[PDB]
Amino acid sequence: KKLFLVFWWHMHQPLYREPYTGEYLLPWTFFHAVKDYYDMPAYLKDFEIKLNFNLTPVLIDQIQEYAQGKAKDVFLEAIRKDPDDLEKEEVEKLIEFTKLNYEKPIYRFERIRELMNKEKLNREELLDLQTLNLLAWCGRTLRKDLKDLLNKGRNYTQEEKEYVLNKYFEIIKKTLSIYREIKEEGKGSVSTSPYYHPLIPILLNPNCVYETTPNVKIPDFAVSFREDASKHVELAKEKYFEIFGEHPVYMWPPEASVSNEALELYYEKGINMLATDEVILKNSVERASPYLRYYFRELISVFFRDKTLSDLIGFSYHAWNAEDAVRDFIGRLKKIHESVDFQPVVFVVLNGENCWEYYEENGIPFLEKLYSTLEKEEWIETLTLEEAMRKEDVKTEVIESVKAGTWFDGNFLKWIGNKEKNEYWKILIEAKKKAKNDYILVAEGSDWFWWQGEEKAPFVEVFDKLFRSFVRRAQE
Numbered sequence: 001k002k003l004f005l006v007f008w009w010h011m012h013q014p015l016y017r018e019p020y021t022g023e024y025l026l027p028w029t030f031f032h033a034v035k036d037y038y039d040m041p042a043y044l045k046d047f048e049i050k051l052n053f054n055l056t057p058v059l060i061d062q063i064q065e066y067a068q069g070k071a072k073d074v075f076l077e078a079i080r081k082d083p084d085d086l087e088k089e090e091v092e093k094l095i096e097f098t099k100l101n102y103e104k105p106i107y108r109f110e111r112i113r114e115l116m117n118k119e120k121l122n123r124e125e126l127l128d129l130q131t132l133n134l135l136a137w138c139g140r141t142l143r144k145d146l147k148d149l150l151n152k153g154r155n156y157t158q159e160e161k162e163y164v165l166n167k168y169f170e171i172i173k174k175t176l177s178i179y180r181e182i183k184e185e186g187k188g189s190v191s192t193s194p195y196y197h198p199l200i201p202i203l204l205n206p207n208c209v210y211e212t213t214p215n216v217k218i219p220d221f222a223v224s225f226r227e228d229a230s231k232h233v234e235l236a237k238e239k240y241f242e243i244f245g246e247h248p249v250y251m252w253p254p255e256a257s258v259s260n261e262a263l264e265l266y267y268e269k270g271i272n273m274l275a276t277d278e279v280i281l282k283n284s285v286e287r288a289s290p291y292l293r294y295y296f297r298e299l300i301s302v303f304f305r306d307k308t309l310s311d312l313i314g315f316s317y318h319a320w321n322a323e324d325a326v327r328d329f330i331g332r333l334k335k336i337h338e339s340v341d342f343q344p345v346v347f348v349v350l351n352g353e354n355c356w357e358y359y360e361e362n363g364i365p366f367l368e369k370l371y372s373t374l375e376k377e378e379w380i381e382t383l384t385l386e387e388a389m390r391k392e393d394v395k396t397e398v399i400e401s402v403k404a405g406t407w408f409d410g411n412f413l414k415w416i417g418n419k420e421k422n423e424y425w426k427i428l429i430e431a432k433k434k435a436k437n438d439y440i441l442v443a444e445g446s447d448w449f450w451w452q453g454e455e456k457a458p459f460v461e462v463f464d465k466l467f468r469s470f471v472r473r474a475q476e
């Protein structure tokens with residue numbers, strides 16, 4: 001009797017490329033590419049288990065742009081430049097960016113603490129700040145090549161910094177290939193999402209917000225987004241086929257978001273399986289075991305992730321020592337295993353790039369201990385998505401209706417329902433009436449609405465500038 005364990009690491013970045021200037025206004029795609037997007041699948045070279053990945057098409061577009069040397073990245077130019085050539089504005093952004101990341105364990109360099117305690121910075125100190133910002137995002141693979149520079153800790157030259165950049169761009173150029181490689185070796189499945197990561201249920205039917213939050217106020221949706229919802233899915237299928245050579249039969253719905261109408265859309269577009277959130281399961285059915293393969297109206301397979309295990313990795317285990325966290329994780333799988341007659345299916349689904357920066361050593365002690373330990377538990381079988389979709393010896397159940405929501409509390413309030421978030425929807429609704437091109441699809445990505453109307457964090461104004469630029473460009 002086995003427990004079936006399915007990791008599904010979701011990788012996404014909204015489009016940071018401003019459409020009028022072509023500049024990448026935040027460097028987060030570059031930094032998560034060099035730290036995580038290559039290195040998360042690359043674990044499969046060293047550990048013989050199954051791990052699955054989701055890549056949004058908008059992320060893939062940006063990785064390709066960086067791999068070609070085409071990406072004009074404003075912050076990265078502030079890193080690359082000799083400090084003598086830095087504008088005052090570029091020095092401020094470098095200092096701001098350091099302070100934002102300063103308490104993260106990946107930034108724990110003695111030299112950074114000293115630099116941030118100085119009132120002014122000369123060229124040598126700025127060179128250190130530039131290079132250490134780069135070295136802080138070093139991924140597992142380059143830890144070996146760059147160990148000399150990591151141990152040096154200070155007194156970096158312009159040529160050492162350019163060496164690090166050259167090795168980082170080599171990593172980016174290999175990033176799409178490693179996803180192809182682990183798929184072709186059978187080591188993991190790769191999925192995608194609707195193209196710009198929108199909230200499909202709201203594009204199809206905004207009234208679905210009332211199923212969980214009946215008293216919320218939303219704008220007047222006087223235009224249809226339903227064919228845009230189709231286009232997001234259709235364009236992602238085309239991109240996926242081009243990159244990976246298959247029609248996608250599974251997709252990750254952005255923010256785990258589902259509704260009855262969204263499930264019908266996915267099925268109509270040929271999607272046979274997806275996953276979503278446990279809170280949605282509990283909001284929708286009575287005997288709500290998340291260890292079953294569900295069939296929505298006998299038409300599309302639906303797994304519900306184990307929210308606790310997914311949240312433990314995402315939010316809690318960063319502060320634990322690696323042995324304790326892995327013992328706790330395995331102990332929780334043991335409890336699941338002993339609590340049921342059948343072979344349970346355990347989906348662990350979370351973002352694959354955002355949590356590691358809070359773990360000691362960028363999560364490498366934790367993930368190496370976890371994957372090493374899973375390799376030796378005979379009663380746990382890690383599965384690809386294809387295997388989980390087809391495994392015959394699992395328990396199943398038919399489900400006829402879901403309560404629309406997302407993995408944020410089972411509802412849509414992170415993206416709609418207050419004055420500021422509603423103002424973005426109103427802008428989009430008005431722009432949709434005059435849209436002439438697919439930049440209206442870009443503006444439907446969930447991220448713009450996520451950041452809107454929150455407490456003012458650094459660079460939040462950049463997301464707003466991008467959103468409105470795509471909305472403006474869509475109408476021309």
Ligand SMILES: OC[C@H]1O[C@H](O[C@H]2[C@H](O)[C@@H](O)[C@@H](O[C@H]3[C@H](O)[C@@H](O)[C@@H](O[C@H]4[C@H](O)[C@@H](O)[C@@H](O[C@H]5[C@H](O)[C@@H](O)[C@@H](O[C@H]6[C@H](O)[C@@H](O)[C@@H](O[C@H]7[C@H](O)[C@@H](O)[C@@H](O)O[C@@H]7CO)O[C@@H]6CO)O[C@@H]5CO)O[C@@H]4CO)O[C@@H]3CO)O[C@@H]2CO)[C@H](O)[C@@H](O)[C@@H]1O
Pocket residue numbers: 010011012013014028032100255307310311314350351353354407408409446447448450457458459460
């Ligand atoms: O809340 C305040 C916040 O303050 C601090 O966080 C700081 C960061 O420390 C700082 O670096 C910066 O954030 C940067 C970030 O570093 C950049 O990489 C980038 O963020 C990207 C991100 O990297 C991308 O992956 C993408 O994020 C999408 C994501 O792909 C998508 O799946 C979804 O994911 C979030 C989801 O919507 C949330 O509900 C939650 O998910 C949880 C649920 O909460 C929970 O209930 C549970 O069951 O499951 C869920 C899954 O784990 O978190 C998910 C993120 O992991 O949406 C996001 C966002 O759309 O794109 C973003 C960019 O859009 O840019 C940012 C901003 O510059 O600044 C922030 C804030 O200042 C603090 O350390 C942190 O803990 C606090 O949360």
